[PDB]
């Protein structure tokens, strides 16, 4: 079917250079993967020993997400007030995506930050709750798509550039940015020509799956702020999810 244009290709080459220089351990991850001890998160609510081990790294994770959007020109052509709104809304969305795409079905464990390998349970009891299943259920699903950096990358942009976040200023400009990526993404998809029936439409559904994850994550954030010590919440963590 239809494919990219010398210009859109160039767009891709960008997004990618971004996601790749901002994705932990690159494709040399499985060798830094250090499985979390079996004992952290067990037989009960929350589980602070875990909640901690998680926020102990959640900081440098968000920064990456920030560093990723910074390498996107269409991003820097926005106001510093919106550049934030975006980060705040898509931060979780881009993070959890990045993790699902790293779900090893054999071991049945995600790999956060490219260093820590967690389990459905662990992640759940850890604070995300129902979101774990959701983030894992995603991973499993995606194992079929075999998304390459580019794809993950593009998918990550489509999220970043959500024109619907509230408080946004330069709406219209953004929407087209998103429109500008979506097209390219699809095209790039055609060149890829995956062996997966009725495709893209499906891939699009994943975007929703990721927005749901983020929308829920916020809810979970509040409980986390009630069932957990404000002594365990790194700033940026709060800076991002806090209203």
């Amino acid at each position: 079917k239809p494919e990219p244009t010398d210009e859109e290709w160039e767009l891709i080459k960008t997004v990618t250079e971004a996601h790749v220089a901002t994705n932990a351990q690159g494709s040399h991850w499985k060798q830094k993967r250090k499985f979390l001890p079996e004992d952290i998160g067990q037989a009960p609510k929350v589980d602070l020993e875990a909640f901690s081990h998680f926020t102990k790294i959640i900081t440098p994770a968000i920064t990456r997400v920030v560093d990723f959007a910074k390498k996107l020109p269409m991003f820097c052509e926005l106001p510093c007030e919106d550049q934030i709104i975006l980060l705040k809304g898509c931060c979780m969305e881009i993070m959890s995506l990045r993790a699902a795409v790293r779900y090893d079905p054999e071991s049945e464990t995600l790999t956060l930050n490219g260093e820590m390998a967690v389990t459905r349970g662990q992640l759940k009891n850890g604070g995300l709750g129902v979101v774990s299943d959701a983030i894992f259920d995603l991973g499993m699903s995606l194992s079929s798509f075999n998304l390459d950096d580019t794809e993950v990358a593009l998918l990550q942009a489509v999220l970043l550039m959500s024109s619907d976040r509230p408080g946004l200023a330069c709406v219209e400009r953004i929407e087209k940015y998103q429109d500008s990526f979506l097209l390219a993404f699809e095209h790039y998809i055609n060149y890829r020509k995956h062996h997966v029936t009725h495709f893209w439409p499906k891939l699009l559904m994943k975007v929703t799956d990721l927005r749901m994850i983020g929308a829920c994550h916020a809810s979970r954030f509040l409980h986390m702020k009630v069932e957990c010590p404000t002594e365990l919440f790194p700033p940026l963590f709060l800076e991002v999810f806090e209203d």
Binding site: T63, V66, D67, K70, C80, Q83, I84, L87, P235, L236, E239, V240
Partner: peptide, 12 residues
Amino acid sequence: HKILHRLLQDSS
């Protein structure tokens, strides 16, 4: 605000 701003400003 705060930090984010900090991250959006670093050349580096």
